[model samples]
Target chain A: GTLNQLFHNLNEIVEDLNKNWHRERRTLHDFADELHQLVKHVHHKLQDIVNQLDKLFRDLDNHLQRKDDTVHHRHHQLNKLLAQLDNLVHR
Target chain B: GTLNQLFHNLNEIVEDLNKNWHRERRTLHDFADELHQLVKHVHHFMLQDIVNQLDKLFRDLDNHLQRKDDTVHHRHHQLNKLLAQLDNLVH
Candidate 1:
């Protein structure tokens, strides 16, 4: 009878511990949910900034296209001018 | 004798390939030089643009600081006039 009583007490203690464990787990889960939401918000903000940078680079490339073309055209013209000058100098 | 003739033919083929290779190398070098010059120009342009933007932003900030206090100054004068009028009415 004493052994049986001891076993009953031990079982009760285990049941109470299990209930406390579940409560702690729930609290932890709630905290994690809040943190996850905050991280997701930060991620979205960073993604938007990245998109803006990508757009800026595309526009920058477009602007550079005209500049590049003009430079190439001018370079050829300058080369021809220099060649003519060289010929005159030599002659 | 057949092996010697074959070796000679192989040498001639290699010599022709080397000449063509050198010609292609020259063209590639010229193109590379042009591209390098364009990249340098772009680098210079981008640097200048960044400097201009920084200067403009500084000027805008200065203008903002100059303009921001006028509204507050106007409100202060209006409040002072109203307070004087109230004192006269009470007397």
Candidate 2:
């Protein structure tokens, strides 16, 4: 959920930037300094979440391949993670 | 598959960025302008269409993964039957 929230924030910033640039029809250089601040925060926040996702998927792949008594339980955990990832960009 | 490829590309870029930034320990500002250029391309060229495709792909993947039908097993059984028929003909 935290990762989802970070993605949502990042998406919002990008969308807003796009809208403003379109409306103003300004060159990229015009918004360079302001955008640098926004993107810096985004880059850091994105790295944290990306690391988490990489780990999550790695564990999930292991669980999927080694299905046993824990299969159902791991699937439940996976669905929750997938749902969160889906929410990031979809909702 | 196209959607999967796009997400993979995006993931690679983020991972590379994180590694480079960590190894260099440079100010975010130094990378700021360059990052702005990268993020600008990512946000503008990569995001909206990729998000749309991912939205569709995730929906399909979720449904398929959650399905209770014996689809995969059924397919395997059918493959075995065909293999038996082929062996009989060869013998």
Candidate 3:
């Protein structure tokens, strides 16, 4: 998918979290505990996206100067990001 | 600080995040990059308060997600709103 599609996918994850907050009810401890885990999920995915973005931009950064002899890598970082988001949505 | 004050302080972080988002403009990748850093700030910085005060807040009241005293009810509102605002920013 394109970068725009990727972010829209990311947006849905947050939107789903908002839905869960309103949909579920429990004691303060229970609520806070679950939120902790959920935020953990969020932290993981967001960090993955950050990694991908940094690499995407850093590619441009290097070109101003670009190159490993093996700089033939695809956007493997984004596959990691999509996998992370998929994991988040499943949980 | 009291529970209310605790939540109010919590409110400040979310408010600061919102403030910063509108305070400047940047590319989508840049925006997500900074937000990732913001979450890290919360995880490391405010985490102490989250763990401690959530315990204190939990023990003090049944804090059911339903009807309750004005104090418990009110503080939870701030907490919930804080989470929701956080969700918005993260999205």
Candidate 4:
């Protein structure tokens, strides 16, 4: 009877220890959750930056007091330079 | 007696079942198996020098993202002072 009781205790101890180990997996899941949120935050920031670039460009175009070809001249040059870099990296 | 034989078989059957359950523990507690190696690389510096040329060209347009290599170095020099004309363009 004593031997049987000891074997039961051993099995129970293994299970208790295993539960402790499983919490480590929960910690990694915590990191995964935070990383997912961070990714969305960065995406929003990029979207905002592009939105401003486009919006302000429109504001310049339609607003009353305005005009110069600098926005036109330099913006086209900026995009061509960007396209060159795009070609450089895509290779 | 047949009763004793049945008891023997019952004990052996529990041992076998417990052995299979031990494998379940292996699968469960061994969850650290997912962190295998990863990732690959892209090119090296000469072009990254050029990449910086494009970026710097963009920034004014822009680092160590620039470099000593002449192909892009010459291009950057061509463009750098040209941005000095930015005030002229806006005027």
- For all predicted structures, in order, the TM-scores are 0.25, 0.23, 0.19, 0.24
* Per-residue lDDT of model 2, residues A17-52, tens digit only: 335334322322333333333334434534543343
Compute the lDDT for candidate 1.
0.39
Task: Compose the digit string of candidate 3's lDDT tens values, residues A2-23.
Answer: 3344345444543543343343
Q: Which ten residues in a row have the lowest lDDT in candidate 1 chain B?
A: B1-10
> Using alpha carbons, what is the TM-score of model 4?
0.24
Per-residue C-alpha lDDT of model 1 across residues A1-91, encoded as one tens digit per residue: 3323322433343344345335534543443343344334433533543343344334434433543454355335434433443343345
> How far off is model 3, as Cα RMSD?
24.7
RMSD of every candidate to native, in Å, equals 41.3, 24.0, 24.7, 33.9
Q: Write the per-residue lDDT of candidate 4 for residues B7-63, one digit (tens) a residue.
A: 343334334434533553343232212111000011122223323322332232101
In model 3, the Cα lDDT at residue A1 comes to 28
What TM-score does the A-chain of candidate 3 achieve? 0.26
**Backbone clash count, each prediction separately:** 0, 0, 0, 2
- Candidate 1: segments with Cα more than 4 A from true spot: A1-44, B1-91
Candidate 4 segments exceeding 4 Å error: A45-91, B1-91
What digit string (tens of lDDT, one per residue) describes model 3 on residues B57-89? 333323332233343344345546545553454
Kindly list the per-residue Cα lDDT of model 4 for residues A20-50, writing each as its tens digit.
3344334334433433443344345334433
Docking class of 4: incorrect
Which model, 1 or 4, shows the larger TM-score?
1
In model 3 chain A, which range of ten residues has the least summed lDDT? A65-74
**Candidate 1: DockQ?**
0.01
Candidate 1 structure quality by residue, lDDT tens digits, B6-79: 23433343344345435534543443344344334434555244234334433433343344234334433543
Candidate 1's docking class is incorrect
